[PDB]
Amino acid sequence: PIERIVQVDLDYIYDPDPEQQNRNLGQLIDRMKDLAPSAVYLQAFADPKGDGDITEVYFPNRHLPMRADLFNRVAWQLKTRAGVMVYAWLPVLTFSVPPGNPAYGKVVQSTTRKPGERGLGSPTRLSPFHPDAHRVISEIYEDLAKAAHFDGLLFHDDAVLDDTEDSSPEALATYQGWGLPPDIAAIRADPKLAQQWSKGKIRYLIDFTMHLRHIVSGYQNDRDMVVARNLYAQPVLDPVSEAWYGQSLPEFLKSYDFVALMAMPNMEGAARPEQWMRQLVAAVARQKGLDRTIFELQARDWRVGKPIDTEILRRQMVQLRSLGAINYGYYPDDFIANHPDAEALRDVMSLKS
């Protein structure tokens, strides 16, 4: 079994001119037919500002405005014309519902964070410990399942909690239920409690995504609903950092069909990108995770706003192959600018590899 995946932004397809939008879609379909990946991870939410404040999505639903009714038709065209599997890529927590929504303002709190700033996680993450936020997110996933036909779910990288979160009253009450004091200062001060708390939050988020899976699978009438989740590299390279990510490679491997590991040394600011990738693969191997870890590479340098040379991307794929990491893919597909170069990547993205 081999996965070769392409993650695709509907933000790149969308255009206020529906005829331009159609031309955009056409270019995507042609590239995916040519490249023939195992799966496309398809954005179901809108994030055109790139700040992770998700006020709109691309499917009809009860809670958020629709930017365009686009996910269902792109998913169907990918499936039927390009012959690929399609995963719905959706946030776990970040839904900026309108005022008057029951979940409005029921967000993840931090003991130290102030207004007007953020850490890795978005300030807009709804608290999965709050019953109204829990239900609203559940209903958004239900509405996705009603609105479109797809083969899997990719749970987004927005599902993070740091070591000062979640400090909201509902979260504290949940920690008390785990046998911890409802007091993050007290938890953090005791290394044993701090470890238990970190692992507890990791499992809580995973369990929440399993709840969402159950909702979607019931509606897709499909027990074979495959799930993947984005995993940051730092918890893999340095597992102590689980405590301020709320993610874990061993726990992910136990719970998801695939782990979408963000193998992106450029984004990470790696001084020695080849060594970095070598160490990342070794870490995954050490956890016996190569069979279900997808090394998701970056095709764009988002910080400087430039495509990454396709030859650099291919060299990363060849390096992965040489190390026995046979599942991989890239994000994003810039189908309008023909980047990455499909001709150059075809041989390594082929499922005969």
TrEMBL record:
The keyword Transmembrane helix does not apply. It comes from the Bacteria. Keywords: Signal. GO terms for molecular function: hydrolase activity, acting on carbon-nitrogen (but not peptide) bonds. Transmembrane segments: none annotated. One of its GO terms (biological process) is carbohydrate metabolic process. This is Hemin storage protein. It comes from Bordetella bronchiseptica (strain ATCC BAA-588 / NCTC 13252 / RB50). The chain holds residues 318 to 670 of 701 of the full protein.
